[PDB]
Design a protein around this ligand. Sequence first.
Ligand code: MQJ
Ligand code: ZN
Length: 272
Amino acid sequence: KYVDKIHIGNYEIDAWYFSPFPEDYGKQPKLWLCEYCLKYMKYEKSYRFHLGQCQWRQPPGKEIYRKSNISVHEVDGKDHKIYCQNLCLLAKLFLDHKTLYFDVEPFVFYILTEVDRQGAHIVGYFSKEKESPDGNNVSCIMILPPYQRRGYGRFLIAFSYELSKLESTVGSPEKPLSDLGKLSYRSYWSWVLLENLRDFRGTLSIKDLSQMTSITQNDIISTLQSLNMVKYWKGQHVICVTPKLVEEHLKSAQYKKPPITVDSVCLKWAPP
Ligand SMILES: O=C(NNS(=O)(=O)c1ccc2ccccc2c1)c1ccccc1F
Ligand SMILES: [Zn+2]
């Protein structure tokens, strides 16, 4: 009755949540998605026919990042409506709190792919309001289950701050965050802040850290609290940490997997 399993690329993936594909699509045992155009289909036969015919081998929009075989495409919801609606219905299978699937025009979508000889394979994405009244620099972020916990979520979170830095603005993801989203942002913020506290030497204040990283002061402060690296004095949070304790944290298991890093030399972007 609801869609409970999809086939995309060479993956079969079980759903985590309800997504409002049309009812007739839910009745089938699996929904079959083209991994390049994200068209959803009811039958293995319509899928195989589509695979032989569809000419797309990467997302639409502009390739604003490419380094080796990792790419990001910026897709404006106005310009590529059906692709963006297909993407938001795919995403809602894995996101409990996303509420927007059809009214995609106010958004831009950043699609992460891993490229081989056959084409550019979707890993995940984040959407971003073109104008955010609350200064959200991500609306929803989703990594398909077979790619989770493999460094791609860290990449996309960093990429969203690389956009904010080019916009000279701070930003924070829209709440609520998933359980894995919370842990991922906390760990990302902790790494970034701890690296800056090692590097600039050298009394940076919180407002300094916010300008260097585009992380809001509130998210810097909550992170520093979790790390016990702030004192409070006459109504003000103040950084309080030794170079040794910064190094103890940076040496922890949390930060030991080799990251896929955003190389800003490979990012081609200016404010929309
Ligand atoms: O797949 C994910 N997270 N896991 S991850 O491997 O990309 C990751 C995420 C953040 C990290 C921060 C510091 C050190 C290593 C980190 C590794 C993920 C899924 C949904 C939403 C956000 C996410 F980030
Ligand atoms: Zn297709």
